[PDB]
Design a protein around this ligand. Structure first.
Ligand SMILES: CNc1ncnc2c1ncn2[C@H]1C[C@H](O)[C@@H](COP(=O)(O)O)O1
Length: 154
């Protein structure tokens, strides 16, 4: 049993857009844009919607770059996070109730202030390799187990 989530990384040649999460889950950490996938929308539509809701950005097209399953010790449901990237955004990022956007250079990504797993799979993201990840967490800071493999289709 798992719940679908989306995650969107606005990746441009020399920079990436991240949102400081202001309230709730993953608060105080930089991350891509996303959330729960709703009933009546595709995974890609939920990703575009969550990008719009959190950053005010529309996009020409999104591409599937990976799937990461997260297990939290004690919680029965897994988080099945579908990851997306994009280059051509439309408009300028604006602050929402959830997210404060900010550009970062690719060698200045604040992994110390992000979900610890990001360290592991970002390199594949930057290399444009598709991937399947799994991370078993104890609380929000400790990875107990993980797997990570290159794939051909997500
Ligand atoms: C647990 N480790 C993790 N590493 C990277 N991204 C994560 C994550 N756990 C959740 N996320 C992402 C998936 C969604 O885009 C968002 C959670 O949605 P929410 O902020 O609406 O609760 O954060």
């Amino acid at each position: 049993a798992s719940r679908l989530y989306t995650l969107v990384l606005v990746l441009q040649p020399q920079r990436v857009l991240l949102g400081m999460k202001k309230r709730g889950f993953g608060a105080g950490r930089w991350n891509g844009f996303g959330g729960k996938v709703q009933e009546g929308e595709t995974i890609e539509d939920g990703a575009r919607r969550e990008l719009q809701e959190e950053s005010g950005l529309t996009v020409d097209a999104l591409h599937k770059v990976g799937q990461i399953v997260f297990e939290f010790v004690g919680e029965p449901e897994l988080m099945d996070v579908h990851v997306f990237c994009t280059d051509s955004i439309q408009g300028t990022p604006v602050e929402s109730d959830e997210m404060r956007p900010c550009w970062f250079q690719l060698d200045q990504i604040p992994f110390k202030d992000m979900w610890p797993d990001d360290s592991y799979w970002f390199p594949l993201l930057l290399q444009k390799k598709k991937f399947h990840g799994y991370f078993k967490f104890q609380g929000q800071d400790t990875i107990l187990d993980y797997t990570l493999r290159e794939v051909d289709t997500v």
